[PDB]
Design an enzyme around this catalytic site. Structure first.
Site, PDB file in Angstrom:
ATOM      1  N   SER A  17       3.996   2.798   8.171  1.00 43.10           N
ATOM      2  CA  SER A  17       3.719   1.825   7.045  1.00 43.10           C
ATOM      3  C   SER A  17       4.970   1.296   6.480  1.00 43.10           C
ATOM      4  O   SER A  17       5.868   2.166   6.045  1.00 43.10           O
ATOM      5  CB  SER A  17       2.744   2.198   6.045  1.00 43.10           C
ATOM      6  OG  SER A  17       1.877   2.832   6.828  1.00 43.10           O
ATOM      7  N   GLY A  18       4.973   0.139   5.989  1.00 48.26           N
ATOM      8  CA  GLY A  18       6.160  -0.752   5.582  1.00 48.26           C
ATOM      9  C   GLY A  18       7.406  -1.104   6.256  1.00 48.26           C
ATOM     10  O   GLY A  18       8.178  -1.664   6.063  1.00 48.26           O
ATOM     11  N   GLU A  59      20.099   6.247   8.034  1.00 44.90           N
ATOM     12  CA  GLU A  59      19.527   7.171   8.706  1.00 44.90           C
ATOM     13  C   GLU A  59      19.157   7.336  10.405  1.00 44.90           C
ATOM     14  O   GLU A  59      18.695   6.114  10.804  1.00 44.90           O
ATOM     15  CB  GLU A  59      17.982   7.523   7.863  1.00 44.90           C
ATOM     16  CG  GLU A  59      18.309   8.119   6.668  1.00 44.90           C
ATOM     17  CD  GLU A  59      18.509   9.491   6.317  1.00 44.90           C
ATOM     18  OE1 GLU A  59      18.970  10.226   7.520  1.00 44.90           O
ATOM     19  OE2 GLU A  59      18.197  10.538   5.234  1.00 44.90           O
ATOM     20  N   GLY A 110       2.848   6.748   8.061  1.00 45.27           N
ATOM     21  CA  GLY A 110       4.220   7.145   7.907  1.00 45.27           C
ATOM     22  C   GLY A 110       4.978   6.027   8.564  1.00 45.27           C
ATOM     23  O   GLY A 110       6.322   5.884   8.238  1.00 45.27           O
ATOM     24  N   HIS A 117       0.808  -0.987  -0.026  1.00 43.91           N
ATOM     25  CA  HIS A 117       0.002   0.099  -0.114  1.00 43.91           C
ATOM     26  C   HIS A 117       0.905   1.492   0.102  1.00 43.91           C
ATOM     27  O   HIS A 117       0.247   2.371  -0.115  1.00 43.91           O
ATOM     28  CB  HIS A 117      -1.113  -0.049   1.074  1.00 43.91           C
ATOM     29  CG  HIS A 117      -0.366   0.406   2.624  1.00 43.91           C
ATOM     30  ND1 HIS A 117      -0.065  -0.121   3.559  1.00 43.91           N
ATOM     31  CD2 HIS A 117      -0.312   1.715   2.862  1.00 43.91           C
ATOM     32  CE1 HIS A 117       0.338   0.549   4.668  1.00 43.91           C
ATOM     33  NE2 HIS A 117       0.249   1.542   4.224  1.00 43.91           N
ATOM     34  N   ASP A 119      -0.473  -7.629   2.271  1.00 51.45           N
ATOM     35  CA  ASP A 119       0.381  -6.159   1.937  1.00 51.45           C
ATOM     36  C   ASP A 119       1.730  -6.233   2.231  1.00 51.45           C
ATOM     37  O   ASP A 119       2.333  -5.923   3.066  1.00 51.45           O
ATOM     38  CB  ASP A 119      -0.361  -5.276   3.048  1.00 51.45           C
ATOM     39  CG  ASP A 119       0.189  -3.875   2.832  1.00 51.45           C
ATOM     40  OD1 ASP A 119       0.619  -3.380   1.653  1.00 51.45           O
ATOM     41  OD2 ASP A 119      -0.135  -3.193   3.843  1.00 51.45           O
TER      42      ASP A 119
HETATM   43 CA   LIG Z   1      20.171  12.057   8.154  1.00 53.12          CA
END
Ligand SMILES: [Ca+2]
Length: 223
Positions: free
Chosen positions: A177-178, A52, A175, A40, A84
């Site tokens: 999600s996944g 990150e 946000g 999705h 999903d």
């Molecule tokens: Ca960064």
């Protein structure tokens, strides 16, 4: 993530952010060349950001690699959210190091009550909102099939698990999600759906990754 805490920086080295202008969804690195996420979250062009911690500042550990191939599960259903799951192939391999590492796929499905770690840069609030700069973490248990299906009568398939708290206050959100649910070193869930976030008696629902290891391996070998 609602009701979590800020992860230590680079302590979740398999977490990726999917970016098209902005962060929009998470993902997990499962080998040098392949990320797994939710179907999705599909968009036609995706930059994968590895290594990150703060998504608004360049810190010097990041690797930004564009997706070359995006493959959604062929039986994904947009109405029920069954299947999903989506795979992304990177245009070059991630270089693995202390900040950027793979997570293992499941050796088996997990027992009810197993403690897991959920992470992401999703919304942190319910009755308001606010998307965080820094990666958020949440420890939560796998709930039994009964507590999950009583929460969502008729809507839980055999490819879905509930992870979370029936009293509310702690959950994943838009946000996230996944992104990964990791339990004893193994990726067991993908952030998928819910009714809202962190509501009493409506825990998050996650794609049940231990049903998909054959599909993941066959897809990687063919592409
Ligand atoms: Ca960064």
């Amino acid at each position: 993530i609602v009701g979590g805490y800020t992860c230590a920086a680079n302590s979740i080295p398999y977490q990726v952010s999917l970016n098209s202008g902005s962060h929009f969804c998470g993902g997990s690195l499962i080998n040098s060349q392949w990320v797994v996420s939710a179907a999705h979250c599909y968009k036609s062009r995706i930059q994968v950001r590895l290594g990150e911690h703060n998504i608004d500042v360049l810190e010097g550990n990041e690797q930004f690699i564009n997706a070359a191939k995006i493959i959604t599960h062929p039986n994904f259903n947009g109405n029920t959210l069954d299947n999903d799951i989506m795979l992304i192939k990177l245009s070059s391999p991630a270089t693995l190091n202390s900040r950027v590492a793979t997570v293992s796929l499941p050796r088996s499905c997990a027992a009810a009550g197993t403690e897991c770690l959920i992470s992401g840069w999703g919304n942190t609030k319910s009755s308001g909102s606010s998307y965080p700069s820094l990666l958020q973490c949440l420890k939560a248990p796998v709930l039994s099939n009964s507590s999950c299906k009583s929460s969502y009568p008729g809507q839980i398939t055999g490819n879905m698990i509930c992870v979370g708290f029936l009293q509310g206050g702690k959950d994943s959100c838009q946000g996230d999600s996944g992104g990964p649910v990791v339990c004893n070193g193994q990726l067991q869930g993908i952030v998928s759906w819910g009714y809202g976030c962190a509501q009493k008696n409506k825990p998050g629902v996650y794609t049940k990754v231990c049903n998909y290891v054959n599909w993941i391996q066959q897809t990687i070998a063919a592409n």
